[PDB]
Amino acid sequence: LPAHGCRHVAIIMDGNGRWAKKQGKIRAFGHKAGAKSVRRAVSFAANNGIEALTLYAFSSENPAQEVSALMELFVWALDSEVKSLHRHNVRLRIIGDTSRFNSRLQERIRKSEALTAGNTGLTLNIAANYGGRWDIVQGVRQLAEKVQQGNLQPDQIDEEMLNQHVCMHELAPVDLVIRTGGEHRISNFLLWQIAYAELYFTDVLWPDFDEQDFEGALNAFANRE
Amino acid sequence: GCRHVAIIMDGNGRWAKKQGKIRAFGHKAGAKSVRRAVSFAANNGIEALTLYAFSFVWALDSEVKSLHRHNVRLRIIGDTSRFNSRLQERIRKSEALTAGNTGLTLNIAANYGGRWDIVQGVRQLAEKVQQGNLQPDQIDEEMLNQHVCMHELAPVDLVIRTGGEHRISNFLLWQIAYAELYFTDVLWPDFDEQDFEGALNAFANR
Numbered sequence: 490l491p492a493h494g495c496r497h498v499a500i501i502m503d504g505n506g507r508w509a510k511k512q513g514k515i516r517a518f519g520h521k522a523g524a525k526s527v528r529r530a531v532s533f534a535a536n537n538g539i540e541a542l543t544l545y546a547f548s549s550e551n552p553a554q555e556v557s558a559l560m561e562l563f564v565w566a567l568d569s570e571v572k573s574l575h576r577h578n579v580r581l582r583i584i585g586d587t588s589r590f591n592s593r594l595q596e597r598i599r600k601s602e603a604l605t606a607g608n609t610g611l612t613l614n615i616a617a618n619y620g621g622r623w624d625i626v627q628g629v630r631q632l633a634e635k636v637q638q639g640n641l642q643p644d645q646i647d648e649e650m651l652n653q654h655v656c657m658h659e660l661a662p663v664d665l666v667i668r669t670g671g672e673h674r675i676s677n678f679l680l681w682q683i684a685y686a687e688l689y690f691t692d693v694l695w696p697d698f699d700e701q702d703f704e705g706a707l708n709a710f711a712n713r714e
Numbered sequence: 715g716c717r718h719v720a721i722i723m724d725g726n727g728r729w730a731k732k733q734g735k736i737r738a739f740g741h742k743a744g745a746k747s748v749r750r751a752v753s754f755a756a757n758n759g760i761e762a763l764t765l766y767a768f769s770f771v772w773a774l775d776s777e778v779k780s781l782h783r784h785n786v787r788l789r790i791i792g793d794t795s796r797f798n799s800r801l802q803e804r805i806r807k808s809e810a811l812t813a814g815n816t817g818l819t820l821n822i823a824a825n826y827g828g829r830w831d832i833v834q835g836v837r838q839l840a841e842k843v844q845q846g847n848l849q850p851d852q853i854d855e856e857m858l859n860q861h862v863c864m865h866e867l868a869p870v871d872l873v874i875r876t877g878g879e880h881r882i883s884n885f886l887l888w889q890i891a892y893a894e895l896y897f898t899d900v901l902w903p904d905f906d907e908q909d910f911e912g913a914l915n916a917f918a919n920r
């Protein structure tokens with residue numbers, strides 16, 4: 490266990506839009522600066538002995554053009570980042586409801602996962618169309634199917650069993666949740682998984698969140714734990 | 715404004731220790747701070763207040779008559795199934811007494827965990843599936859929501875935790891998806907109306 494004590498960090502990346510607005514730029518330039526901040530945080534986590542990093546691109550807590558814009562942002566990010574991740578020995582996984590993504594994109598997600606699946610460095614989980622409540626409900630559906638098959642008794646369902654059906658159950662528990670951008674809310678990111686996690690909120694905007702900020706959040710966890 | 719506030723009330727043990735007093739004394743100052751927080755929420759039009767003691771039937775019993783007079787609806791949330799049956803009966807009686815009240819709903823967590831709360835709703839749905847009254851593909855967020863604690867109340871708008879720790883500690887999980895989280899180093903027994911107003915400000919600012 491590294492000195493900072495963290496095996497699994499999750500990050501709500503917020504502030505890309507406010508960052509571009511401060512500079513008189515459109516939202517697109519915030520997205521580009523955001524991506525650069527993702528690469529820097531990935532490389533920092535990998536160099537600092539963290540087992541798993543899970544990232545959530547915050548957009549809002551709420552239309553056609555919205556989803557579509559977010560879908561395109563995911564498409565662009567996946568296409569652009571997967572080779573670099575593979576080359577940094579990162580194992581990539583996507584968590585979230587990808588069921589209604591079109592078959593071609595679902596294929597691209599699957600190939601990106603299979604490519605990096607034997608990587609031994611950081612495990613990087615990227616939330617895409619993810620919500621904490623959906624994650625719980627899909628695990629509940631898996632249990633309900635087992636009941637309907639006659640394989641599972643309602644009274645055998647306990648916390649440990651539902652734990653084994655939510656996303657990331659096979660990785661170290663989430664030790665620390667960082668939210669940048671100044672809001673003090675989880676916004677339907679991980680819920681079940683953050684029952685015992687340290688919550689660390691910083692006003693720094695995502696594109697500005699750098700290695701010293703990440704180091705500060707790890708050290709705060711080391712000191713508070 | 716803020717309709718439903720939940721508070722993790724931590725710092726009683728540490729407060730006692732700063733005072734050079736035994737744990738018991740801190741419990742007793744924490745109970746005075748409960749009374750103050752309940753009055754403040756009821757005087758300020760908050761619809762629901764949900765309190766979790768992070769570090770009982772007698773305390774409830776001696777306070778229920780006054781809560782009832784103040785039109786407070788008292789509910790206990792959590793697994794009371796292993797409390798002795800006399801105490802279970804007294805909890806049920808206090809709830810039934812105040813159940814018709816239309817002012818502040820005061821939810822007191824007792825042996826509560828946010829994971830436990832979700833699991834109890836899941837077990838209920840699992841029962842319905844096994845009886846053939848429910849298809850697994852029919853299970854959605856609104857449905858599970860209807861089987862977790864407090865689903866008849868306004869969504870939790872704000873969670874306050876006193877005592878300096880920055881964690882939810884398996885208090886509400888499902889219900890805090892969109893809540894403002896407000897952490898204060900103030901120890902629970904010291905937490906007063908000014909501290910409670912500062913938390914409501916953080917909500918109003920956002």
Ligand SMILES: Cc1ccc(Oc2ccc(NC(=O)c3ccccc3C(=O)O)cc2)cc1C
Nearest residue numbers: 546556559560562563566567570615616617618
């Ligand atoms: C390596 C890497 C790093 C960061 C990264 O950031 C993201 C993550 C997710 C989205 N979009 C959705 O999550 C989404 C997709 C469809 C519909 C709704 C949504 C929704 O945001 O709600 C955009 C950008 C992606 C990758 C691939």
